[PDB]
Amino acid sequence: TTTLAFKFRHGVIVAADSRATAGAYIASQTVKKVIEINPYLLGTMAGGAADCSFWERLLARQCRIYELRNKERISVAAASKLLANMVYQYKGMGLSMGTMICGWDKRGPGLYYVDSEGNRISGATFSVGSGSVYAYGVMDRGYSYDLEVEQAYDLARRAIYQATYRDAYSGGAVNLYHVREDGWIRVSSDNVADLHEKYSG
């Protein structure tokens, strides 16, 4: 499992793999680990597959009620704070959750990191998963705030490919989204076996 997210001048780029294992047995290769909370928010999946699927679908319920009462959409910092409080009431009972929250805000881009233990931090770049440490090194090299859009795609696309190459629990296909001004736009979804021929030559 390997997810990453980084913000730059033209919004936020989110990428992930698609392999979900069960012990040494691979259950599936087509697991969508970047679930779509809203047309204006995104959330990742790391750790508990059903723990991240439930509590972020429960978050999408809560953000909709906020819009119907206040007649504007919730900010990214407020949305992460609601998620961090719901998880905290089951602290010690054994929830596995390491997600990230992305989205455009009135203050510009937004990128937050929520653990199941109660961590809530902002930042510029993040990488979550079993093969996350394989993603930091290749992402720290080619990162700039002033990247172009086609260059930011090929950065985050190859960075997942270097993590799936070393990690045994990561693989499948490379999903890739782009959080923009108005909302998120799905970029691509490339197979690793197709990228292996691309990046070798």
Partner: protein, 124 residues
């Protein structure tokens, strides 16, 4: 626990305990407020001072946050407990969504607190 319906309907369609409480407002001292385009100005009249009292414990303009002021009329004993319940809510908004409280939000909290309180059991 005292369970009794206080506010009920009239045979023609009124809530008598509501509109009796509106006449308790109609003999409290006058509070006037206008808004400018850059500076709001509101000021109560009839301080009704008797020159032997502390002038600050008789004030009827308080603040709920740094940005939200509040004046009232009616009877003062019911006022300063609605205010103290509004101070908790506008503070609990900041532990939630990070911005300070919009002035429309704190009116919806006071108005919805006041409606459901004309609906419960054993409460004027």
């Amino acid at each position: 626990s005292y369970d009794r319906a206080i506010t009920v309907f009239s045979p023609d369609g009124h809530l008598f305990q509501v509109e009796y409480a509106q006449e308790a407002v109609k003999k409290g001292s006058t509070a006037v407020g206008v808004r400018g385009r850059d500076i709001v100005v509101l000021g109560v009249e009839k301080k009704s001072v008797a020159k032997l009292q502390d002038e600050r414990t008789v004030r009827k303009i308080c603040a709920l946050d740094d940005n939200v002021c509040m004046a009232f009329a009616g009877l003062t004993a019911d006022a300063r407990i609605v205010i103290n319940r509004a101070r908790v809510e506008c503070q609990s908004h900041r532990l939630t969504v990070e911005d300070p409280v919009t002035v429309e939000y704190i009116t919806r909290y006071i108005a919805s607190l006041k409606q459901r309180y004309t609906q419960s059991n054993g409460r004027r």
